[PDB]
Every structure is written in C-alpha cells, then in structure tokens.
Amino acid sequence: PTLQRDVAIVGAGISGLAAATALRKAGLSVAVIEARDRVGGRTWTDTIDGAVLEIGGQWVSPDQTALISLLDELGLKTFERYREGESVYISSAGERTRYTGDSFPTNETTKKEMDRLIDEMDDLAAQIGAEEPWAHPLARDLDTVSFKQWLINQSDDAEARDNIGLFIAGGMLTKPAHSFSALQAVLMAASAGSFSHLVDEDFILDKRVIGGMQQVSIRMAEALGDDVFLNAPVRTVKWNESGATVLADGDIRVEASRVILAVPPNLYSRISYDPPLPRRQHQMHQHQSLGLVIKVHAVYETPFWREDGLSGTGFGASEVVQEVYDNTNHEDDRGTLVAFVSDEKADAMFELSAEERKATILASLARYLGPKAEEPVVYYESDWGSEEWTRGCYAASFDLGGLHRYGADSRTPVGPIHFSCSDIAAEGYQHVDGAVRMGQRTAADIIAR
Ligand SMILES: Cc1cc2nc3c(=O)[nH]c(=O)nc-3n(C[C@H](O)[C@H](O)[C@H](O)COP(=O)(O)OP(=O)(O)OC[C@H]3O[C@@H](n4cnc5c(N)ncnc54)[C@H](O)[C@@H]3O)c2cc1C
C-alpha cells in the first residue's frame, strides 16, 4: 500500500502515539508505523506462566502531570503501591535493619553526609533545570567530571556515596556512576522535580495503572484504527525541504509533509536516510546508549511479607539486587515482588546460567525478606536487552561528556524530520511522562507551523 498523510510517525510507543493523538485533534492526518506485533514499546503487559506482569514501565509519580492528564482523558484510573509496615536496609557492612520513614538507618554521621549530598543535588537541580542543563554556567564543569568522581569530591563517606549512587546510577540511568557525568545526575534530579523526589520511593514509585501501563498505548492506538500499522519495521526515509517518503516492510510507503522518529536514539541509525542526516546527527547519535537493568518478578501465593509487618521495600547498594518492592496487582490475592539488578551487576548475572542466575537473585531477595522469597510459584526476568527494537532499559543517555556537547541538538529537527521520545525529554526524562510531554511538544511544533 501507498498513502498520503500530513505526518508519518515511526514507532507506536507512548511518545509516537501521544504525538498522533495530539495531531488528529488538530485535524492533521497521520500514519503510525510500528516494527513490533503490538503497540506500547517499553511498556508491555504480558502473562508469564499464567501470571499477569508488567514487563516494562509502570509507575506514576505525582509530578507526572502530562501522564496523569492523559490517563484521565482515556478513562484510566490508578492504585497505589502497598507501603505499610517496615522497609529493609542492608548496609555496606552486610548489616540488615528494619526501619520506616525518610532516611536509612545508618549511623548519624552517614545520615548527615547523605542529607548534605541530597541538599546539594536539590540545589543544583533547582538552579540548572531539565529544559537546557547544558546552558548553565556550571554545566561544563559538571559535565566533564563523572558522577562517581563528583561524589568523591563532595564526601569522604563511601556508604553515603554508594547510597546516593543507588538512586541515580542503578536506580535511574542504569549505568555505573563512573560512566556518566555529574551534569547527567543533575538532569535526572531536575527532570523529576528534585533529587529528593528520586530518593523517596513513595513519590517516584507512587502509583500504577489499573489494567496496566500498556493500556495507555493500546487505547490511543485503538482510537486511531487503521492508521496504525504493526509488523512494519521502517527501513528508509527519503526526504527534502518539503516532505518525506517513509518505507516499511510489507511494501508500505507513506508520503508525508513531516516525519516523527518516535524511537529511542540508539535506534535512529537502524533506518537509512536519503540523503544522509548531517554530520552533527551522525556524531551525536553514536554517543547515545541505553542502560541495562534486569527487572525481576516473583509471584507467591500470598504477599507473605505483609504477615511479618514488612512493606516489601528493600534497599542495599552492596547487594546484587539493589532494590525490591511490593508489586502486587490491584485486587490480586497472590503477592508479587519486583526487583532490580542494574548495569554491571546485570552483566555478571547474565553470564551465569539461567538457573544459577535465578538462585542468586532469589538468594538476594531472601536476604531482604526472608527464606520464603526463595520459593516463588512464578519467576520471570524482563529481557529488554535482547529485544532488537529496544536493546536495553530503562532509557538512553549520553556517554560522559555528551550532554553538554550535544544536548542543544537532541530535539532539533532535520528539515521535515522530528525526534520524539522520553530519552530526549526535559521534564519526565526517561519516563512515560517524558514520552507524553515530548510527543505533545512535537505535535504542538508541527501544528503551529
Ligand atoms: C524494564 C523497564 C521498566 C520501566 N519502568 C519505568 C516506570 O515504572 N515508569 C516510567 O515512567 N517509565 C519506566 N520505564 C521507561 C518508559 O517505559 C520509557 O521511557 C517510555 O515508555 C519510552 O516511550 P517512547 O515512546 O519514547 O519509546 P518506546 O516505548 O521505546 O517506543 C519506540 C517504539 O518504536 C518502535 N520502533 C523502533 N524502531 C522502529 C523502526 N525502525 N520502525 C518501526 N518501529 C520502530 C519500537 O518497536 C517501539 O515500539 C521503564 C522501561 C523499561 C525498559
């Protein structure tokens, strides 16, 4: 088939779909062309051994106002993650302590260094912002020092440094702290409202969508009907000043005035551009890369930890599993845990056989929540790294030095080609809410021209 549209959109993730949605409301015609046999991208609900699981993005925080509006508009409701009872902290010394409230049960010294580092991150985020962090007079010095070396410059206390790392390195960028800059940590902080919001799992991990985060794409895509094309990898974009022809598998050909690349930036060069994108894009794209995390799911006949008075929340910067949370489905009576193995720790796990990796991860959950954690009825690991249409998780970020050198160019159109994904977002950077903001921002740009 061949069609004409105002706008061809590559990818039916949140970002592409929100763009299409905003475009249609303005009266422009669209086609959304999607490689996979489904919409949603890095959001996906699936059933593994008869257990429904959220394989990808899923949590909504209170400052993600673009996503919260969108849910409302689509008739979707939220429920909150269970947080009653005590959380578990594992120290660098291997000590394991139950606690509630806002800081980790370390000694008073470490507690104070932590508070200091968190205040300093909040202050830099408030000054620098998420819209154009590379623009600030502090930017260059913060972008040429790794986050690790920055923590070293700020504090002699390793346990406080590792804990701060826990929330940004392993908990957001999913990269080790020696490999992104301090400016990138600040961006991540600014993008979520403040560093303190990232520290508090009651904020950043506040809510889930009844029916699963994937319903958001599924419902946007449904409203578009036949303008969504699945099982259609885009291969080729031919373009000039006044438009673009988009070529996809199954002999799809869309002639359009503008194209949106709604794909994460490590995937831009899966498509041939004719003529080639300019030098700046050739270079900039090579410097963007996804992190890596193993999202572990474990289903038990009851949420057993609630009986021992535990929330299900656990943190330990020294553990293979650095975080665990109650992830029980809305009105499920079966208990589900979610846990995260980040970056180089994920590499090490992936080198063990499937069976050794499971036992190792499970032995780690047991250290937080006791030996019942080792006998789940269902066990699963989200594997985004293997997916040719994603290739990592949660999201992409520049190598060290990239943010200030290329940040100004990451949203800039090339002729009729626009770029829209959470990985280039300002507020909501790397998250579903960032994908919505960018899709709407892109739509809004195309519409006013
Ligand atoms: C394990 C994991 C857990 C997460 N947890 C959180 C969380 O709880 N909350 C939060 O907000 N976010 C979370 N995220 C991040 C969030 O899901 C992403 O930020 C967001 O969904 C990205 O949306 P997107 O539209 O920008 O890109 P994507 O969802 O990646 O969509 C891009 C789409 O493009 C398609 N595509 C790529 N190339 C082509 C091509 N050449 N032709 C056609 N189609 C193509 C892909 O198949 C894909 O559907 C998580 C992500 C992962 C990976």
TrEMBL record:
Q: Which UniProt keywords apply?
A: FAD, Flavoprotein, Nucleotide-binding, Oxidoreductase
Q: Does the keyword Nucleotide-binding apply?
A: yes
Per the record's keyword annotation, is Membrane included, yes or no? Answer: no
- GO molecular function list: nucleotide binding; oxidoreductase activity
Annotated Amine oxidase domain residues: 15-447
Could you say which residues bind FAD here? 15, 34-36, 42, 58-59, 234, 422, 430, 432
The domain of life for this entry's organism is Bacteria
Residues bound to substrate: 340
Its required cofactor(s), as named, are: FAD
Q: Which family does it belong to?
A: Belongs to the flavin monoamine oxidase family.
Q: What is this protein called?
A: Putrescine oxidase
